[PDB]
Structure 1
Amino acid sequence: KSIRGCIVGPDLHALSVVLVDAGDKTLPGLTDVVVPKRLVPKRASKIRRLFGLPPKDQMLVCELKLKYPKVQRVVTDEKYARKQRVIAEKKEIMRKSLQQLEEYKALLSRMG
């Protein structure tokens, strides 16, 4: 694709700029209004950092029904059980397979 170069030239019809220093002579519109975020934290770790906490959460900023961001990255009792259950399933697989290996070697010794 065709792209202009990263140098300012008199051809540019548009320039995009950001404010890196202010201090005095506050700009008429740039510093006039603080704009609120459109969305509030959704990740639970971010939500707990927001309140300086570090499975509570649940409470959240509400916007009028008051819409709530579905909680994300929070270990619910069901999630905690799932992680423990899957850990147990892999542990059982290790137990059963090792037991079979020892038994098979014994059967092989029985026949020589």
Structure 2
Amino acid sequence: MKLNISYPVNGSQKTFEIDDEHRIRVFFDKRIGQEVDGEAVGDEFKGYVFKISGGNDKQGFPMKQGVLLPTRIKLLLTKNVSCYRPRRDGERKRKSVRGAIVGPDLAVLALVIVKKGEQELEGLTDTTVPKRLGPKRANNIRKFFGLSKEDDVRDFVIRREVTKGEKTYTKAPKIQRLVTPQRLQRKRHQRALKVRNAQAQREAAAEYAQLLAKRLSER
């Protein structure tokens, strides 16, 4: 009986091995999203409210987000669902998934910390991970670092130094949707091609109408 507990705030997670039934009956019959607290589960966690979202049973089947059963059943799974990755465009497979309501069958639960009650866990706030990637889009960097539209956002893009061969040439990410004279020239080229084509069609039609009104003059 294991507990994969994750702290999304600032990034963290770790696993516990709760080997007593009395201190884990607080999860039985809870399906998804309940205020199961630290004081209710074990002495160590206290004031920690666990968002109980997912888990795996013995024989390794994951949980299904909304099946609402205490056993495992077979579903025809599709593209945009959990527990299945389609190996081919349009593929669907009948896979046995485990229900949403927790019980003893679960070999491991998956909990999300949503409230901090008392003394921090040693893998909860002290040790934290950075965000692996900074924003890539121009407006994403603007929305991140607060700078407004007219701020010339190509300067403080988060970088990374590679201590590999004593040269450490920083790999700054390319930014997309950036307002650039190349894109402005592409826009101008398209919006000028359109009017050029329209004028060409108009003059071709005019001269053909001239030909018609000339060859109609014969009577």
Structure 1 Cα separation of the partners of residues 204 and 107 of structure 2: 76
Report the equivalent of 2:158: 61
SS in 2 for 1:66: coil
Of the three residues 93, 99, 102, the one matched with 1:5 is: 99
Structure 1 partner of 2:214: 110
Q: Report what 1:70 is aligned to.
A: 174
Amino acid at match of 1:4: R
Deviation at 1:11, TM superposition (A): 0.3
Q: What TM-score, normalized by structure 1, do the two folds share?
A: 0.87
Does 2:155 align with 1:52? no
Which structure is higher in strand share? 2
Residues in 1 aligned to 2:100 and 2:195: alpha-carbon distance in whole angstroms: 58
State the 4+ residue runs in structure 1 displaced beyond 3 angstroms.
none
User: Which whole-Å CA distance do the structure 2 matches of 1:58 and 1:94 have between them?
Assistant: 38
Secondary structure, counterpart of 1:3 in structure 2 = strand
How far is 1:26 from its partner? Answer: 4.1
What corresponds to 1:88 in structure 2?
A: 192
Can you list the C-alpha shifts for 1:42-77, whole angstroms capped at 9, x where unaligned? 111111222222282222122111110012110211
Q: Secondary structure at the match of 1:17?
A: strand
Please report the RMSD computed on the Cα atoms of aligned residues, expressed in angstroms. Answer: 1.7
Deviating more after overlay: 25-34 vs 45-54: 25-34
1:99 aligns with 2:203: yes
Q: Which amino acid counterpart does residue 213 of structure 2 have in structure 1?
A: S
- Whether 2:172 is the aligned partner of 1:79: answer no
Write the letter of the residue equivalent to 1:47.
I
Number of aligned residue pairs? 111
TM-score by length of 2: 0.47
Structure 2 CA distance for aligned equivalents of residues 111 and 52 of structure 1: 69
- Identity level (%): 41
**Contiguous gaps of at least 5 residues in structure 2:** 1-94, 162-168
Structure with greater proportional helix content = 1
What's the offset of the Cα at 1:79?
A: 1.6
Determine the structure 2 residue equivalent to 1:41.
Answer: 135
Change (3 A) 1:26 1:101: farther
